[PDB]
Design an enzyme around this catalytic site. Structure first.
Site, PDB file in Angstrom:
ATOM      1  N   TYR D 149      19.229   4.960 -31.077  1.00 56.86           N
ATOM      2  CA  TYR D 149      19.425   3.849 -31.974  1.00 56.86           C
ATOM      3  C   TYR D 149      18.063   3.352 -32.552  1.00 56.86           C
ATOM      4  O   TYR D 149      17.909   3.123 -33.771  1.00 56.86           O
ATOM      5  CB  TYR D 149      20.112   2.702 -31.257  1.00 56.86           C
ATOM      6  CG  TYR D 149      20.219   1.494 -32.162  1.00 56.86           C
ATOM      7  CD1 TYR D 149      21.160   1.409 -33.179  1.00 56.86           C
ATOM      8  CD2 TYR D 149      19.318   0.448 -32.073  1.00 56.86           C
ATOM      9  CE1 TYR D 149      21.203   0.281 -34.020  1.00 56.86           C
ATOM     10  CE2 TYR D 149      19.397  -0.623 -32.952  1.00 56.86           C
ATOM     11  CZ  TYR D 149      20.356  -0.687 -33.883  1.00 56.86           C
ATOM     12  OH  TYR D 149      20.372  -1.781 -34.751  1.00 56.86           O
ATOM     13  N   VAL D 150      17.090   3.169 -31.693  1.00 55.66           N
ATOM     14  CA  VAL D 150      15.819   2.562 -32.097  1.00 55.66           C
ATOM     15  C   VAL D 150      15.108   3.510 -33.072  1.00 55.66           C
ATOM     16  O   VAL D 150      14.503   3.123 -34.071  1.00 55.66           O
ATOM     17  CB  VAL D 150      14.948   2.196 -30.855  1.00 55.66           C
ATOM     18  CG1 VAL D 150      13.607   1.639 -31.306  1.00 55.66           C
ATOM     19  CG2 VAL D 150      15.653   1.142 -30.015  1.00 55.66           C
TER      20      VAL D 150
END
Lengths: 244, 244, 244, 244
Positions: D149-150
């Site tokens: 996600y990051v």
């Protein structure tokens, strides 16, 4: 021997990263010259030199005289390690003393700038050199109630990219190491290490879950002094276990 | 009216971002209170007030008296705009004067810290406020031959995240705007704007290919003073046409 | 010998930082294991091994098989050097192909993540390790007309602090080196080095005024693999002559 | 009216910052055009339009058709708000699925790049525009167990400075807002807000000690769309209560 035949001058060697850096630089083959305010005293010089055989304690303590003496020893300085430390005083807005803010800036920004002005000209004539500010990661995150301290470390860090630009054409690199949570006498001294509750709180907020070793900080600084770090400049290298 | 019923105190209003900020804050409905060292003089007060009707020029010029007076006017201050500017002196290592480095730090880091210490307590009691440092983008890139200037702007920027942490539980935000290449009397004055060759060199190195307007800097500062910026804190917002 | 008795696996060793890193790691005492897509071929393995005696070319080229084989050689891996490179295609908005953006992301973010998933479990069981992404400084400044490339390097860099947090309690560090302007076959190849006009334009925009050596990038990566860099994690170390 | 007579197109308006942004843009005088995958359905269009009178729900949902339709409505688009959101899946190394990493990158980096390629040409012909990526602060700190996600948010953020450079000469600005801890349906939905223990843990780690309002994120995005933000470009503006 990564620093074979390199002359490294380390300032304020009794504080902060001085010992770690001396120790690793010597193990990597450097010639170490050390300044400290205590080194006008023969016994202090003798104690440093007996702990770190091969390192030379300079007997001049004021900046201009200390540099002239350092330069006389071998004719040159390959790396300046500006090892600067003023206490991080708990100073909420309502209690902070402006005179302490000025003193922090003096020690952590104006003094290393002065030393750089004194050493840089000899490097330029050689077209080689290294300048390493030993500084703090704290400005990368900020710390409530210590803003004067953080701000003065930020001023220090804020010399680096400008000086890098100014000295880069002469091939001299300029960097800082942004330390935090490294065992050292200024910020993480033995008394703090022995406070179990303090240590539990501290290590819970570091990704590596431990404090750093003075040898790790020393090895970092040594790496930036080496020939292999010749394409790194203008940088503030965080050395805080992932905390920044 | 984005700043309807907000009392904004702008310091050193005759320098740097003062006029842009006054102009936009008034257009957005603010009550503007202005400090300047020239405002001990009635004619200077009259000239500001006639140029910016609805803005109030404070007749006290020293920090503690100026704050006490600002606070007396309406009972409170919603936002402090610390508009601080010292000359960027060309200062290569070999010519830089240490006393000028100290003076830059005084003006750009110690003085706004002092003003924050004076204004913050009134905000805390309210549980609302805004503190905006008007600062420089220069530390984000570095500038050869101006390192004292850059370093002192870095010290300024380096208050922000620590103070944000310290005041955030009282809902007060603390931010900076890192200006560069904005038409202003301190750094980009009319004489510079009229130097065609200077302007060609400058705009070739800005992504937007132009200098910024004092109204753009003012609108930025105004935005950080507004209610809509209440979840932004601890930040240094670059305002330099993409240059940082 | 800074990497005495350390087993270092370097991926895609025929690209980007592979040779510099092999060369320095061997000089610093490491055991080097190398992957390359060409290493299913005996002659390619033989050519690498004859150029870098003591380095081992692994004959498995697919990720899971290559890791299992690397691990079988000595039983463990002390450091993974994820040496990943996809072409920086000139791709203005109006001409950029979405399929090339996906391919860049595959090579520079998804593939090194996969390799990390494969190697990490063996390190965790040991409570020691090093993961180094060899990446780009480009996201630190941005580059017009190359945004897909820059964005995919940003994705790469954007694994680092999250993985550092996730693996830090097992004492494994995770960092990246953000290279730019380093002589290498992917981005700064010999043909480019021989274009006098290209070189004049490039070096005018680097503070050190020159391109970096593949040995400098190699020494940087080697330093992050060493025991002395054990308190550095979560970091993207710019290695671009001051350009970022 | 800060956005008087500005045509703002907001994508995926039912997710993330869509509603906050619609609400504030309309209050500041904008003409709002909204895309959503649900807007092929008349009742979904009717529900949006009845909640936000004056906003127009576009009935085309695929990118090229949706843009052509948006452009037909008034002839131009002054600002694109790329409001992109894929779930933050808990994905430790050992469980993360590579296909989900690719899907995150598709949604958060490739899709907004595509939309920018479609909208940008109309702005260039006008020499004015604004492109705002609604993104995440998470890459500024890193998050254990969410690295895919990051990393994909980092890819998104990593378009910004390159596109800013590429479009800046046509006076179009390109920025991102790096949100975190803002009440929203994707990341901080009502169910989470009602979990007292979750909320206590979350707000203890935010300097302002609270979650942000969707109106605060909306006001931020609106500010970057305004004329007053015309000298801000290439920037990722953290909007996370001081958390980054």
């Amino acid at each position: 021997m990564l620093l074979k035949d390199r002359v490294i001058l380390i300032t304020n060697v009794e504080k902060f990263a001085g010992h770690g850096t001396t120790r690793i630089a010597l193990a990597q083959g450097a010639t170490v010259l050390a300044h400290d305010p205590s080194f006008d005293t023969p016994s202090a010089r003798h104690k440093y030199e007996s702990q770190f055989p091969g390192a030379h304690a300079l007997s001049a303590v004021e900046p201009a005289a200390m540099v002239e003496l350092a330069l006389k020893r071998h004719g040159h300085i390959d790396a300046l390690v500006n090892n600067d430390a003023y206490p991080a005083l708990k100073a909420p807005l309502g209690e902070a003393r402006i005179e302490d803010f000025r003193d922090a800036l003096e020690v952590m920004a104006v003094a290393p700038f002065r030393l750089t002005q004194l050493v840089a000209p000899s490097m330029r004539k050689r077209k080689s050199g290294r300048i390493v500010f030993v500084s703090s990661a704290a400005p990368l995150r900020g710390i409530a109630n210590y803003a004067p301290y953080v701000s003065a470390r930020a001023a220090g860090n804020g010399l680096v990219s400008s000086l890098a630009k100014e000295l880069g054409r002469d091939s001299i690199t300029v960097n800082a190491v942004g330390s935090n949570y490294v065992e050292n006498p200024d910020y993480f001294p033995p008394a703090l290490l022995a406070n179990r509750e303090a240590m539990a709180k501290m290590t819970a907020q570091i990704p590596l879950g431990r404090l750093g070793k003075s040898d790790e900080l020393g090895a970092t600084i040594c790496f930036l002094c080496s020939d292999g770090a010749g394409f790194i400049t203008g940088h503030v290298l965080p050395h805080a276990g992932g905390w920044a």
